[PDB]
Amino acid sequence: AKTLLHQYWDIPEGTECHRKTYAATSIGGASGLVVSAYSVALKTPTSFLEGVARTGRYTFTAAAIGAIFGLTSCISAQVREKPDDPLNYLIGGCAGGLTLGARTRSYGIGAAACAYMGLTAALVKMGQLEGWKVFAEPKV
Amino acid sequence: KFYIQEPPHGSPNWLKVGLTLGTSAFLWIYLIKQHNEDVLEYKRRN
Amino acid sequence: MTGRQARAPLQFLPDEARSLPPPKLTDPRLAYIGFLGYCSGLIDNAIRRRPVLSAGLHRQFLYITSFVFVGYYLLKRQDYMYAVRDHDMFSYIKSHPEDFPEKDKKTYREVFEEFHPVR
Amino acid sequence: MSLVYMNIMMAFTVSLTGLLMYRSHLMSSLLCLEGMMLSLFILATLMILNSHFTLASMMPIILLVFAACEAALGLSLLVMVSNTYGTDYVQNLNLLQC
Amino acid sequence: MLKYIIPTMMLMPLTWLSKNSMIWINTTLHSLLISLTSLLLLNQFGDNSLNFSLTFFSDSLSTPLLILTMWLLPLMLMASQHHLSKENLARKKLFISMLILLQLFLIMTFTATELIFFYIMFEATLVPTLIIITRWGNQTERLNAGLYFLFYTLAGSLPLLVALIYIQNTMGSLNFLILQYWVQPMPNSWSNTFMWLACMMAFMVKMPLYGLHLWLPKAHVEAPIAGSMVLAAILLKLGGYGMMRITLLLNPITDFMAYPFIMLSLWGMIMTSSICLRQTDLKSLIAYSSVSHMALVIVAILIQTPWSYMGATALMIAHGLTSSMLFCLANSNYERVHSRTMILARGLQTLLPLMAAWWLLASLTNLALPPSINLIGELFVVMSTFSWSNITIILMGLNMVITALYSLYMLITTQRGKHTHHINNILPSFTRENALMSLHMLPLLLLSLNPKIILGPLY
Amino acid sequence: ARQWQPDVEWAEQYGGAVMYPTKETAHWKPPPWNDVDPPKDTLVSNLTLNFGPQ
Amino acid sequence: PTLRWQEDPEPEDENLYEKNPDSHGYDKDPAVDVWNMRVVFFFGFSIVLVLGSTFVAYLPDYRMQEWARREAERLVKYREAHGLPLMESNCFDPSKIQLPED
Amino acid sequence: LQYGPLAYILGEKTTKKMTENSKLITVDGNICSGKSKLAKEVAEKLGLKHFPEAGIHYADSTTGDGKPLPVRFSGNCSLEKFYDDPKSNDGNSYRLQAWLYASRLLQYADALEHLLSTGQGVVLERSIYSDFVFLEAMYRQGFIRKQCVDHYNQVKKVTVCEYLPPHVVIYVDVPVSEVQSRIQKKGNPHEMKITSAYLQDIENVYKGTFLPEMSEKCEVLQYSAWEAEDAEKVVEDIQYLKYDKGPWLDQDDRKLHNLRMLVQDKLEVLNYTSIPVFLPEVTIGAHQSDRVFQEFTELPGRKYRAGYNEDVGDKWIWL
Amino acid sequence: MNPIILIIILMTVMLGTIIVMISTHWLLIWIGFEMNMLAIIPIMMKKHNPRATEASTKYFLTQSTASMLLMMAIIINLMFSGQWTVMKLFNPMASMLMTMALAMKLGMAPFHFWVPEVTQGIPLSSGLILLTWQKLAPMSVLYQILPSINLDLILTLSILSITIGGWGGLNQTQLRKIMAYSSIAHMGWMTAVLLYNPTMTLLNLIIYIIMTSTMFTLFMANSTTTTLSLSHTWNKAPIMTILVLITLLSMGGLPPLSGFMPKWMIIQEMTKNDSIILPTLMAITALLNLYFYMRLTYSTALTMFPSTNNMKMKWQFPTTKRMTLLPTMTVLSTMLLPLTPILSILE
Amino acid sequence: LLDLIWLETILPKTISLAQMKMSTTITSQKGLIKLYFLSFLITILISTTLLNFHE
């Protein structure tokens, strides 16, 4: 949500390491709560215990995405030490996609997840670096 | 006349077609009238 | 762009629309609307199994006349709206002349740029 | 903020969730819609009586007579549903599948 | 030019209100008259292009392509019989009127004032060719071919509209004259990189480049002859024309970000020449030939020498004529035997003796006939790219060797070695095919005489 | 007439209630053509009373 | 027991010849075949090809080419008559420039 | 046209052309015995108009010009071929039967159109109900795969659950040997190549299913073979009847208006014919369909709306 | 029913939407929405199947709770700065509830669950009138109350409506669900501009209404509800094929055709702000929702499906249908490319 | 190995299968009512308390 994504962008890039992973796990747990809420409110999984299992699995996978993404973010920022590229977070989003493919146990599907999540992470870092206004100006 | 005892239409009337030709002539005369009045209005003003 | 003095309700053809030159004969847009009317009547005869290019000649004439009439009034409203946009623009130029300074129109004898050689 | 308004709006929200979630019938859902109607009526009535809003005092009576005929329409619809079946369950409505 | 647009609007109802066995001669005759009428076009001189109206202006890049389009129409309109003679009169009128409407949007596309009008007429060019190939595709996957075609060309050509509106509201009007005068270098940001990649990627998709050329083989093996020739010649060289016009802006960053397109173009040209060396289904060989030549065109565009642009437009016009001719040769083979393959129809030196002259001449024009326009284009592109890099001549010459190779194998697979002596249903060589070949190749040799027309605006 | 045409099994594939049958959705049976469900059940014989010695 | 179809044996092989041996390329109406041959070999070659050939063989020169030849001859004779070297470099006036200094 | 909502408001009713002449009587019997004989008899006696048996070319015989089109267009039924070989691998039974189903529906629509349009009541014969009896007996003889029978049953589920039943059914019973004697009297050898167990199954299902599914809706008057002409007796017990069952006492104006405006626009009636399930005896390839439609347009009368088509008339395309 | 009764009920639908259009007060707007509901119920269930019964049930429940949520938002607005004028609100929460209530009222992707289900099991006249007037009514209110809306709501509902209206339908073969998904997509396009220049939104509303009238009129050319019926419309008449072709391709949004004009001008007055990611997302999904259009086209307009006889029987009969106004709306709704400067007609 | 099968797996197949799977997951909602109103409820709650719109 809004206050904790502002917490994530408040953490510089920059090296204030593994607080980045704490914030990214919080973001992933929020998103997993969203999609798990849809998946339990649109299915009737029969029963309640299986619904709790599906929610915990979805939140665990999404928090794993955020965790490993923030870890390799910090690893790129500490080893290669280029702070303002889209290339490190391209690598990071690919790492998150491949670990999602690991947790769903699919290989080419995990490679597609690597490609798309890396491109989205490159878009996020790249547009945030140059400065592209999210959602609106909203002026004219 | 070549049909199995059933003319639905086709033999034309003389109310609908005359009414349509009359109202289209009415609309042409009205648009030419309006356009000449507006040309005269623009000549009046400038 | 909002009304702009709706005092003075919707008023499909306003009073000041007669204070501007109306469109004339053989203007291309009304000719386009007339060809659209011809195609309208032709395709109307093409809907039912009556033959095309025949037996709908009063429908041809009525549809062409009606579309030219409608499009003529629409063109009048269109030119009114563009004219009042122009007058509102130049009146806001007149209201705040200070906010729009004349830019430094240097001649190219004193303009420095970059070259960026392609080879 | 006239703290009776607080739990009136709270009970409005609980009535709205009663309209939303329901597991067996539809008449109970329509009845919770009527309770939500009562909540709107009461809130508007207390406000217009507080403000000395004497000129447009038509709002609560007209609100309730209109949402009353809404509820009548809902009754006729549920009678048609219950008449083309034996019951009025949320179940046996899953036809016209998506 | 409006006097070239308006007789095409007059040519459409000609097809409708001419009667049975009367549509054909009237359409053919009058479109040839329009070919005369726009042969009268070339008034262009000296300092500027010939520029008449808020509506119209024509460069000498647009001049030979427009003449080529109106010349290619009636040839095609005669070429597309024998597969709809048995069809309905109304469906025949719909076919011919769809061709005329497609020509009209081609001329609209070539003489666009602002690039918004160019984009509108660009996808207006896109739409009826779909209807042509889908209504008369004559193979079971015309479904898949039209679907691939429309989705690739839209979804590659989609951000082009956004980028053009962005250039509209950042630099005033989008007319090519003032944009020629109000260009300014937009340096290495990242938004400049995305915008350049948007425009260039849309026209890349139109060429096609090697990265997503896969729609192009299906769109030529699963199309009738008219849509095939229109598609190949006018649409791919129209994409090249559009890149030629839009590349005037965005000069400072092309040294940064023009390297990988050169790479994919060169290596995919080599791989395309490799993959067409072996395949059957003779009709597809011309399509991969087109992919190779347009990869060469794309290299010629992205290096930015006037030598390169003149060679580019020469290769455009030459491969348009050659590929249309060779398509009609493949159509003649497909009318003879109902195969479309490569190894079945063999022999044909005995049978159809002067057909061999046209196959030989077509494989010569693919072979870079030594005074032909094709060799002029390939030669000047090799000159400019050897100026651009001293080591890229290896790939160019390897392309040359394999180009000669597959063109020669395309010749000697069909028309050399043994008649299969079981076919026994070929009719003798019609006057129609030889007439169409005389309509193809006499203009190519005339332009080979005095090619000062076909060189572009940087003449 | 030498042209390939779409056929019966092609239009079957462009048929049914849904386009893509999966591991669950194949029981989504195709809707009828008059949009009229059959008159099913529920007590055409309406009701009974027993006036006894009460 | 089933064939799923009702059509003809489709298609049918149809040779265009052996009903008009003097036919040209297209369909079995023989007179309009000669009409088509006449219209394409007169209004495609006899009036299009050679007339466009003589049109493009000479026309007023593109890029004012012979004009540029004679202009260059005049200007080179001018500059060699007035002693200064032909093609003086710095094509714009260096006195009429305003260089932004460092 | 004097129909639609405005004509229904300005016009009086759809009910004041009643009654006791406007009625649906339907003579139903076996093939070659219960036929147009007693139908034309009661049509002349009771003063009530008559439709013939629904022909194969009845659609040609009811619109356009009276001359029937050849069996390339109205076929491909070939009732003589069905009597020759009713086990065709080429497909002859069900195509014929669906065409006759459309013919029965067309003539029943003509019947209800003439009934609602001012009167004055009609006699019918060999209805839609005898058509499903024909299909059931023809399946008892083992001529059709059961899936195709299910398809016809689905057509019956769609089209029959829409309309009103007739008023009365005058049933004729003629025994099997007597129909054999009458078909020997008829003497058509194509028709004489029919078998008799098929006829036996027709009469068995035609008594055992049709008559209980009447259930005094469509009041039946069951006659013997010599209980015929006897025209006085059949008009006497038609006079006996009282019209209790059926929805004819409950319409009363709105649904009669609905069927008046529904029976006309005959294409709205006949849109529910092709369901389709694709019926491997019944479908047509695209090339054959195209050439058949072009040859249909190559008739003089049936060439795009003959009321406006030239060469027959009508001297007015408004210059 | 009676024709006089239907005259009265359609007159009341007209009157209800006009009262929504015309009043400066809130109560009359809510009464207009309610009268719209009350009068649009009996147009559905015009036949007598339980399909229309369950459809009317779903429509009544969603429609009613949307109206009640709207009345809640108005009474919250008078809990804050107190007047019954239709202008800028005085609460983020009241505007939040009001946009959510109007989103349930017309149909956005969080709230779109009732629209295909109600549009399937109904006759075509009911579906046409519900689509046209139920998308016409709340857009007037949104046009009036626009300067008080947080952009996150309209933006999220618009993006999600375009993408869910795209992604639904690719499995769907029922034509009513296809057209309802198209309605969701075009309402998302109509919503995403309203905070920038609402003239484009009302213009897209006019264009979509004319297109929907042409679409359902050519579906009322004969009784068709599935694609195979459209193959039979191919083999029974040739002009219906090309008209369905051109109207489908104008719903697709291609530049030489009229349905591109609402898309491109929206992109223009979007991108005179710095919104680029939003046009490229919306336009990629506008590429996406053309595929079901295109497979309908590929099915029954350009390929030639095998047909069934008794179409031979149907060949004898004229198309004696009534068209409300088909050809006028058709050729006005397709050839309207060069009249793009009739944008300014809307002031 | 490069053009046909692998290029047709990388550009059309991933996109087409992704859209097919998103269709078969979204439009395959079985026709209940409580599911739709619980979706309404989670929409209202996730708009209020998670990612607020009033604040």
Short mmCIF file of C-alpha atoms in Angstrom, two decimals, chain B residues 10-14 16-18 21, chain C residues 50 54-58, chain H residues 308 315-319:
data_model
loop_
_atom_site.label_atom_id
_atom_site.label_comp_id
_atom_site.label_asym_id
_atom_site.label_seq_id
_atom_site.Cartn_x
_atom_site.Cartn_y
_atom_site.Cartn_z
CA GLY B 10 -45.63 -3.31 -55.44
CA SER B 11 -48.49 -1.64 -57.17
CA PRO B 12 -47.44 1.81 -55.94
CA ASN B 13 -49.51 4.17 -53.87
CA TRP B 14 -49.79 7.91 -54.45
CA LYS B 16 -46.58 8.27 -49.37
CA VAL B 17 -44.40 8.97 -52.42
CA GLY B 18 -46.11 12.30 -53.08
CA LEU B 21 -41.46 14.42 -52.64
CA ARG C 50 -35.51 -4.44 -54.06
CA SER C 54 -33.64 1.81 -58.95
CA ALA C 55 -37.13 2.07 -57.41
CA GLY C 56 -36.02 4.13 -54.43
CA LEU C 57 -35.49 7.39 -56.23
CA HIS C 58 -37.69 9.45 -53.93
CA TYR H 308 -40.00 -4.66 -57.60
CA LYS H 315 -44.12 -0.55 -64.64
CA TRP H 316 -43.09 1.53 -61.60
CA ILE H 317 -39.54 2.01 -60.43
CA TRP H 318 -40.53 5.70 -60.09
CA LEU H 319 -38.88 6.65 -63.42
#
